Design a protein around this motif. Sequence first.
Motif, PDB file in Angstrom:
ATOM      1  N   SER A  35       6.793  -2.161  13.063  1.00 30.02           N
ATOM      2  CA  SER A  35       6.527  -3.717  12.981  1.00 30.02           C
ATOM      3  C   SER A  35       5.817  -3.760  11.604  1.00 30.02           C
ATOM      4  CB  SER A  35       5.977  -4.211  13.974  1.00 30.02           C
ATOM      5  OG  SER A  35       4.724  -3.785  14.241  1.00 30.02           O
ATOM      6  N   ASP A  36       6.122  -5.065  11.086  1.00 25.02           N
ATOM      7  CA  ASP A  36       5.361  -5.618   9.719  1.00 25.02           C
ATOM      8  C   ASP A  36       4.132  -6.245  10.155  1.00 25.02           C
ATOM      9  OD1 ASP A  36       6.698  -7.516  10.937  1.00 25.02           O
ATOM     10  OD2 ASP A  36       7.552  -8.136   8.725  1.00 25.02           O
ATOM     11  N   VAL A  37       4.373  -7.254  11.364  1.00 20.29           N
ATOM     12  CA  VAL A  37       3.284  -7.784  11.903  1.00 20.29           C
ATOM     13  C   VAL A  37       2.394  -6.758  12.737  1.00 20.29           C
ATOM     14  CG1 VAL A  37       4.538  -8.602  13.792  1.00 20.29           C
ATOM     15  CG2 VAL A  37       2.257  -9.389  13.454  1.00 20.29           C
ATOM     16  N   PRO A  39       0.139  -3.779  11.615  1.00 20.67           N
ATOM     17  CA  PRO A  39       0.726  -2.639  10.979  1.00 20.67           C
ATOM     18  C   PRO A  39       0.275  -1.396  11.617  1.00 20.67           C
ATOM     19  CG  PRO A  39      -0.161  -4.203   9.522  1.00 20.67           C
ATOM     20  CD  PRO A  39      -0.405  -4.709  10.821  1.00 20.67           C
ATOM     21  N   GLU A  40      -0.864  -1.528  12.594  1.00 22.93           N
ATOM     22  CA  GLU A  40      -1.006  -0.382  13.321  1.00 22.93           C
ATOM     23  C   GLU A  40      -0.343  -0.060  14.610  1.00 22.93           C
ATOM     24  OE1 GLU A  40      -3.120  -2.874  12.404  1.00 22.93           O
ATOM     25  OE2 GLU A  40      -4.221  -3.728  14.080  1.00 22.93           O
ATOM     26  N   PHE A  41       0.880  -0.579  14.733  1.00 21.52           N
ATOM     27  CA  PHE A  41       1.861  -0.007  15.853  1.00 21.52           C
ATOM     28  C   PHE A  41       2.958   0.887  15.372  1.00 21.52           C
ATOM     29  CE2 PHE A  41       5.561  -0.892  18.484  1.00 21.52           C
ATOM     30  CZ  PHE A  41       4.941  -0.547  19.789  1.00 21.52           C
ATOM     31  N   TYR A  42       3.178   1.857  15.864  1.00 20.56           N
ATOM     32  CA  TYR A  42       4.216   2.885  15.655  1.00 20.56           C
ATOM     33  C   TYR A  42       4.666   3.429  16.818  1.00 20.56           C
ATOM     34  CZ  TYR A  42       1.166   6.883  16.241  1.00 20.56           C
ATOM     35  OH  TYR A  42       0.166   7.889  16.774  1.00 20.56           O
TER      36      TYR A  42
END
Lengths: 50, 66
Positions: A35-37, A39-42
Amino acid sequence: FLKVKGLVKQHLDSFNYFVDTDLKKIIKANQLILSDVDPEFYLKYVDIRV
Amino acid sequence: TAIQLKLNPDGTMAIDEETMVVDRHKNASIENEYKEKVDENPFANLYNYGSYGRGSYTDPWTVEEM
DNA sequence: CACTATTTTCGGCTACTATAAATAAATGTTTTTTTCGTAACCCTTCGTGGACATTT
């Protein structure tokens, strides 16, 4: 010849190569949904099994 | 994380192609790396009626505070 | 056999959970308008000859 290697060679040995190896070459080319919103999610797909 | 430049002998006072824009993910990446790595067992995330609700447990009062 | 000690348990403390009323104001949450394949055959083009006017 036909004992070890029958008459439906061409159908059985194709799907059996898809399930074993040719799934792991898919998720390794579509890994890391991002996600771009925020940015610390993967989320990453490590391996796949049937 | 401002704009950076360089001194090229060929082109003096030239502006570089990469720092023109920012990634916005590399500073998020290092933030993630020193996080705890836990292996989930399906019995940990157990939820009941007392879940996703208000409130807590107040510390039982003392004679000092009376 | 004496007591240490996690286990088992009581126990009470706490904290809403509905259900009805007063506002009152702030807050968010979601709809209804208002606007930004072969073969004719027309089609298109290159072109060639007729006569008119100026000029020798």
